[PDB]
Amino acid sequence: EGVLYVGSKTKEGVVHGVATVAEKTKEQVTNVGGAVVTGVTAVAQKTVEGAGSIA
Amino acid sequence: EGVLYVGSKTKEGVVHGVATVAEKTKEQVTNVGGAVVTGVTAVAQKTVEGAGSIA
Amino acid sequence: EGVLYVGSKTKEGVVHGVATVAEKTKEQVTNVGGAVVTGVTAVAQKTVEGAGSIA
Numbered sequence: 001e002g003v004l005y006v007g008s009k010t011k012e013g014v015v016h017g018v019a020t021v022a023e024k025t026k027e028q029v030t031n032v033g034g035a036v037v038t039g040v041t042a043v044a045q046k047t048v049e050g051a052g053s054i055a
Numbered sequence: 056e057g058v059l060y061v062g063s064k065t066k067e068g069v070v071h072g073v074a075t076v077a078e079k080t081k082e083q084v085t086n087v088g089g090a091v092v093t094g095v096t097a098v099a100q101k102t103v104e105g106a107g108s109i110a
Numbered sequence: 111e112g113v114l115y116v117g118s119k120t121k122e123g124v125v126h127g128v129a130t131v132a133e134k135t136k137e138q139v140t141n142v143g144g145a146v147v148t149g150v151t152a153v154a155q156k157t158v159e160g161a162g163s164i165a
């Protein structure tokens with residue numbers, strides 16, 4: 001029964017620019033956070049928890 | 056029954072610029088945090104917890 | 111039943127610039143923290159906990 005609460009108050013501007021390039025690469029895993037982020041945030045990329053892939 | 060609470064108060068500006076390049080590379084795992092981030096944040100990239108991949 | 115609490119108060123500006131380059135490399139694992147980060151933060155990259163990958 002866990003409760004939550006989030007609150008944010010910004011007044012001036014927030015510029016936020018991202019760029020990602022990949023040329024002739026075999027793999028590129030990227031995770032960029034936000035400019036003003038308040039609260040829980042979970043990211044999972046190319047993970048394997050149980051009974052993975054077989055070949 | 057764990058509860059949570061997050062709060063943030065910014066007034067001036069937040070510039071935030073990211074860039075990621077990859078040329079003819081076999082692997083690139085990247086994780087960049089945010090400019091003003093308050094609260095929990097979990098990231099997992101190319102991890103293996105149990106029963107992984109087989110070849 | 112562990113509870114949490116986070117709070118932040120910034121007034122002036124927060125410039126935050128990141129850059130990552132990789133040219134003809136076989137591996138690049140990177141993790142950059144945020145400019146003003148308050149709170150828990152967990153990162154895991156290319157880790158192996160149990161029953162890993164086989165070849």
Ligand SMILES: *[C@@H]1O[C@H](CO)[C@@H](O)[C@H](O)[C@H]1NC(C)=O
Nearest residue numbers: 047048053054055108109110
């Ligand atoms: C198994 O799964 C992972 C990601 O979960 C993937 O990268 C890999 O190519 C897979 N391997 C096989 C043998 O299926």
Ligand SMILES: *[C@@H]1O[C@H](CO)[C@@H](O)[C@H](O)[C@H]1NC(C)=O
Nearest residue numbers: 048102103108109110163164
């Ligand atoms: C197993 O999984 C990992 C990531 O979880 C992946 O990098 C790797 O290519 C996989 N290996 C095999 C033999 O499937």
Ligand SMILES: *[C@@H]1O[C@H](CO)[C@@H](O)[C@H](O)[C@H]1NC(C)=O
Nearest residue numbers: 103156157158162163164165
């Ligand atoms: C096993 O997993 C790790 C990452 O978890 C990966 O780097 C590696 O390529 C894998 N090795 C085999 C033999 O699958």
